[PDB]
Write a protein that binds this DNA or RNA. Structure first.
Lengths: 1053, 50, 39, 22
RNA sequence: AGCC
């Protein structure tokens, strides 16, 4: 236990007074060698805690802000009284960190670290002397204007920020995030320029540093690559491809290094300067270090008019060539007929009721407008769209046929989504009837995209070498890759008229291919959303006035914007590659589009020279410019930039910009949930090359998970509360290892968190008894089936109860009751007694039968991701990277091929697991509640194919429990021939459920032993026949511990 | 010697023993290890010499 | 219980522990056939 | 009261019909 | 006391 040692040492630092006492609370598994639950703390003298210890670190000179480096007047670091004159006009939304942790908490987490490492040995001393020279700059600037005391909900009022500079809080937050990631001398020279210059230059610093990364991935030679097959399976190929670069790229890379010297950066353009002499892959992680560090400057929060002015003001002309727009509109028309040819001819059940298909899946839509609703006696304000339907279905206003206009009378409100170092993107806020019309038709466009080679939904898995590995499979010395960066994709001229009229023309060739009266109707309503968006006005508020701007283009926030933007690229890059073939003769190997970032691999006849690269790039940005789409045409021979991934020289490099101590939107979480987002943003940045200290993170989990009931008492939970596998998990003991503990007091506490895993909310039980909720449930049972049954109607009325957990105040009355019920268990050490099978109860019976021995494995495979940590790179080089991805979606089964066809619901794999192990007449009672007819659910039960479907659901459910497809286990090959020489388990037939879990648990204990220690072990399990039958009856009653904030911990982006 | 774990796994597939029925081909694997192999070699030579 | 002899039930061996489990999953199968007829 | 709670498991319906093996 |  190491977190318990830092927890006791922290409270002896922040409470320096004599009146502070700490009472540890212990507990045991027996009645009468004990692990501790929490640590009490009574401290009374608490005024001026941080402002007294800051003065001993405030030396040197403070930073004087430069006031003539930004174009706008409210982006400079001026005094707030000089910027906002009165307290009535004070906008917090330009500097708000939007995290529930104040600046006075972040300064104690550094001053606690600087005391523990004040007198270390000569290797760890140089890290301390580099993190002290940076903290002198941060402390002496804050101490001049003082420390701003936060609000009760962690905002900053006007009266505490009156005499300070405006961005003092949101600069001291990001600079503490940067100085706690300095490890080498190269990391100290980057952090000094991004701390000094970031005090004045709040506009164009993250753009100048992160600019030359699209160029530098085209200079590094390839010597050995990973490729992928036609089906997505990995291969290793060791060709040699030379990098060819024209003389105008180096005349552009020299321009990017002289823009970085006008801004004042004088030691970041010396590392790129000294790397270009070699152009080597062995020094390239220095060039991705500078690209990853540039995103930690901070967010560019601006006014909504001032950030949507260059986007909404474009020059549309009629001096384009109209001969090129006829082929562009025809190629969009040919795709929509090609996508909906099979679900319209054979009339699918999903298109026949598009009104019901959007109603039962409106929890996937974006948040709409803020509207006043009335649910019985209560009056609530909500932006979720399925709450707008329950108010509109009661008052006699629910008309899904009539689609409202978005012209000058009723404009479209606008929301933003921004990323540091890029421009901002606007998001439409559409009514709730643009989601119902565009859901059953777009879902038929995204099943064709999962079987077509040129789209992005084909190469969409959990791994990252199998998805973006088709870039380098066509690479040779006679080919070139052509990745182009369209600047303003949203409002270009090729998107307003010919894109909406290419879809409308494609839905008129599908109104003559069918014979039902319903499929003509759902293809007419999807056509009606395109004529109304042909002339759309947008609404942007500024000051007193509200501006209405005409905007006939395509923005995000729609439903079709992920599958119809991919059609407009494959029709536009097919027209440009046909105009460039009048000067050259090639053969297009692959085209692959993902939104608005794409590539295309052209294979030439003769060898590629330096003249065929400079003159193809001048025929891409001159053919695009004939269609009024200005682009930055880039061609390369070795490496590209596919979407946020940088494949340079055979290796794949990611970006590591995730802001830990800042956020872009004010989230609706608690502190306990944002202490697991802060940890899971540290594991992501550690795997990509931005290593923050662990002891700064573990200090930040101490200051966020603690909760007080009185102003003098504090409760700090221990390691065994936060690390155990339950609802309340925050972090793990070792970093990349998910451990399931097996001790008689560790299963005793995991069952003790099973009582208060389900709490009730006082808001959702008053909505569910109101009259307008019963009117919404009653009119869904009419459309779902023509009959009336009492079983299906309670099965519907208790399904929209869980849909109200997406509402933000309802999902906060549960979580505020989780932590307030935990405090009665951390104070009273005795708990309750119950029995319920978890995953740890199964592993209690398997672990005493494994015998370990020492073993060795020589390295045989090489590394394709060179920014991974050292203990994970020993696993990959010894057992191999993943070759093929095993699916856990369950759609290969025969019950998930029946639910998806005959109904619109989607049941969770934790729901299909519980019902597949019951009798025949219990699967019947469940399948009718899904919407399946009685004659179909009598077929599947009466066919006895559920007996052979028991093992296709348990295979995909155990892979979800142990998190094999997600986490950091999605890199190692599990069917490798080098893990089977270590696992030696004799085979005993006729029980497949137990033999499967003996080989999946033995494969994890060998991997989790070689990350902790770096040495391999071999296992042997002579499991008896009398213990296999006892474990066989517990493989079906296993229950999982699901949490809402943990479902985001499975994916990276 | 041949490994105990690498020979029991080879022997447990030639026998094809099932984990549900009770049979007399699951007693072929009892008391076979590397210490008893070293014991019978000693007490067969040293019994003949004395 | 199983109503087999008492020196097999309280015994701790491997050939006598499997015999109790096989006679325990024959009862659960004989009760599974008798229950399906009654429905 | 969800539907997954009300439907009884296979081991519950195997106890309303009793018989002894020997 | 409620999407500030």
């Amino acid at each position: 236990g190491k977190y318990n040692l830092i927890l006791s040492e922290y409270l002896s630092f922040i409470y320096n007074s004599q009146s502070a006492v700490q009472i540890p609370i212990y507990y045991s598994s027996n009645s009468e060698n004990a692990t501790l639950l929490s640590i009490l703390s009574y401290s009374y003298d608490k005024y001026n805690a941080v402002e007294r210890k800051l003065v001993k670190y405030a030396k040197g000179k403070p930073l004087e802000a430069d006031l003539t480096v930004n174009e706008l007047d409210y982006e400079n670091n001026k005094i707030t009284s000089e910027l906002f004159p009165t307290a009535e006009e004070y906008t917090d939304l330009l500097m708000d960190p939007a995290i529930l942790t104040s600046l006075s908490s972040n300064l104690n987490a550094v001053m606690f670290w600087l005391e523990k490492h004040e007198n270390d040995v000569a290797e760890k001393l140089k890290i301390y002397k580099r993190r002290l020279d940076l903290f002198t700059i941060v402390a002496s600037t804050v101490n001049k204007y003082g420390v701003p005391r936060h609000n009760a909900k962690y905002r900053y009022e006007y009266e505490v920020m009156k005499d300070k500079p405006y961005y003092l809080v949101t600069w001291a937050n990001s600079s503490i995030e940067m100085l706690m990631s300095v490890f080498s001398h190269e990391d100290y020279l980057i952090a000094r320029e991004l701390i000094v210059l970031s005090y004045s230059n709040r506009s164009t610093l993250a753009k100048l540093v992160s600019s030359p990364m699209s160029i530098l991935v085209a200079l590094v030679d390839i010597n050995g690559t990973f490729i992928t097959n036609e089906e997505l399976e990995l291969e290793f190929s060791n060709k040699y491809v030379r990098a060819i670069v024209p003389d105008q790229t180096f005349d552009e890379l020299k321009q990017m290094l002289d823009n970085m010297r006008k801004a004042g950066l004088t030691d970041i353009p010396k590392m790129i300067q000294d790397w270009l002499v070699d152009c080597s892959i062995e020094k390239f992680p220095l060039m991705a270090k500078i690209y990853s560090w540039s995103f930690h400057v901070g967010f560019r929060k601006q006014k909504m008019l001032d950030a949507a002015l260059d986007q909404l003001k474009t020059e549309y002309t009629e001096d384009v060539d109209d001969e090129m727009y006829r082929e562009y509109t025809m190629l969009i028309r040919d795709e929509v007929v090609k996508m909906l040819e099979e679900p319209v001819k054979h009339d699918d059940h999903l298109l026949q009721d598009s009104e019901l298909a959007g109603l039962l899946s409106m929890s996937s839509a974006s948040n709409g407008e803020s509207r006043q609703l009335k649910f019985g006696r209560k009056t609530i304000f909500s932006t979720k769209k399925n709450m707008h339907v329950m108010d509109d279905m009661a008052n006699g206003r629910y008309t899904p046929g009539i689609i409202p206009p978005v012209n000058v009378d009723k404009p479209i409100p606008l929301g933003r989504r921004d990323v540091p170092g890029r421009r901002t993107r606007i998001i439409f806020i559409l009514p709730y009837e643009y989601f119902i019309a565009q859901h059953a038709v777009v879902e038929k466009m995204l099943i064709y995209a999962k079987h077509t080679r040129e789209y992005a939904e084909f190469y969409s898995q959990s791994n990252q070498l199998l998805s973006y590995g088709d870039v380098t499979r066509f690479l040779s010395n006679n080919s070139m890759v052509l990745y182009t960066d369209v600047s303003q994709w949203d409002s270009s001229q090729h998107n307003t008229q010919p894109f909406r009229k290419g879809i409308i023309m494609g839905l008129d060739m599908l109104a003559n291919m069918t014979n039902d009266a319903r499929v003509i109707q759902t293809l007419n309503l999807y056509k009606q959303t395109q004529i109304n968006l042909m002339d759309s006005y947008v609404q942007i508020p500024d000051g007193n006035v509200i501006k209405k701007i005409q905007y006939g283009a395509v923005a995000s926030g729609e439903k079709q914007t992920k599958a119809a933007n991919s059609i407009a690229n494959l029709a536009l890059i097919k027209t440009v590659l046909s105009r460039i073939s009048n000067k050259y003769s090639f053969a297009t190997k692959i085209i692959r589009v993902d939104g608005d970032d794409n590539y295309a691999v052209l294979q030439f006849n003769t060898e590629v020279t330096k003249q065929m690269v400079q003159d193809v790039s001048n025929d891409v940005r001159e053919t695009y410019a004939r269609m009024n789409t200005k682009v930055k045409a880039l061609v390369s021979t070795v490496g590209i930039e596919i979407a946020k991934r940088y494949i340079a020289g055979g290796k794949i490099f990611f970006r590591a910009g995730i802001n830990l101590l800042n956020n872009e939107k004010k989230g609706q979480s608690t502190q306990w949930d944002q202490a697991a987002v802060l940890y899971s943003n540290y594991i992501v940045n550690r795997l990509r090359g931005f290593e923050t200290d662990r002891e700064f993170i573990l200090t930040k989990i101490m200051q966020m998970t603690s909760v007080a009931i009185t102003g003098s008492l504090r409760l700090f939970p221990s390691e065994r509360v936060l690390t155990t596998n339950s609802t309340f998990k925050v972090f793990d003991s070792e970093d990349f290892i998910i451990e399931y503990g097996t001790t008689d007091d560790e299963v005793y506490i995991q069952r003790a968190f099973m009582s208060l895993s389900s709490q009730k909310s006082g808001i959702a039980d008053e909505i569910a008894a109101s009259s307008t909720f019963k009117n919404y449930v009653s009119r869904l049972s009419e459309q779902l089936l023509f009959s009336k049954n009492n079983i299906v109607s309670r099965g519907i009325a208790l399904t929209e109860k869980a849909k109200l957990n997406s509402y933000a105040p309802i999902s906060l009355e549960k979580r505020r009751a989780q932590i307030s019920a935990l405090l009665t268990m951390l104070q009273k050490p005795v708990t309750f007694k119950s029995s319920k099978i978890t995953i740890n109860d199964i592993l209690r019976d398997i672990k005493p039968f494994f015998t370990v021995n020492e073993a060795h494995l020589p390295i045989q495979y090489q590394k394709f991701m060179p920014t991974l940590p050292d203990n994970v790179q020993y696993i990959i080089q010894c057992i191999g990277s993943r070759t093929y991805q095993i699916e856990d979606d369950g759609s290969k089964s025969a019950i998930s091929r029946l639910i998806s066809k005959y109904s619109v619901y989607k049941p969770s794999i934790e729901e299909l697991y519980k019902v597949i192990s019951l009798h025949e007449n219990e699967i019947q009672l469940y399948l009718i509640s899904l919407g399946i007819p009685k004659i179909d659910a009598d077929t599947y039960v009466g066919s006895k194919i559920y007996s052979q479907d028991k093992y296709r659901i348990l295979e995909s459910y155990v892979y979800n429990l142990l998190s094999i497809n997600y986490g950091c286990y999605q890199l190692f090959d599990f069917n490798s021939p080098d893990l089977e020489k270590l696992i030696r388990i004799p085979f005993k037939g006729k029980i497949p459920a137990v033999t499967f879990i003996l080989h999946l648990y033995a494969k994890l204990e060998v991997i989790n032993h070689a990350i902790k220690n770096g040495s391999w072990i071999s296992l042997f399990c002579n499991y008896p026949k009398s213990e296999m039958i006892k474990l066989w009856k517990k493989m079906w009653n296993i229950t999982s511990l699901r949490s809402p904030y943990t479902n985001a911990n499975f994916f990276q982006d | 010697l041949v490994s105990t774990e690498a020979q029991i796994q080879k022997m447990s597939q030639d026998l094809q023993l099932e984990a549900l029925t009770i049979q007399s081909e699951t007693q072929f694997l009892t008391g076979i290890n590397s210490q008893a192999a070293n014991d019978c070699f000693k007490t067969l030579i040293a019994a003949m010499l004395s | 219980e199983i109503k087999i002899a008492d020196e097999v039930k309280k015994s701790n061996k491997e050939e006598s522990k499997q015999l109790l489990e096989v006679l325990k999953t024959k009862e659960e199968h004989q009760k599974e056939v008798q229950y399906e007829i009654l429905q």
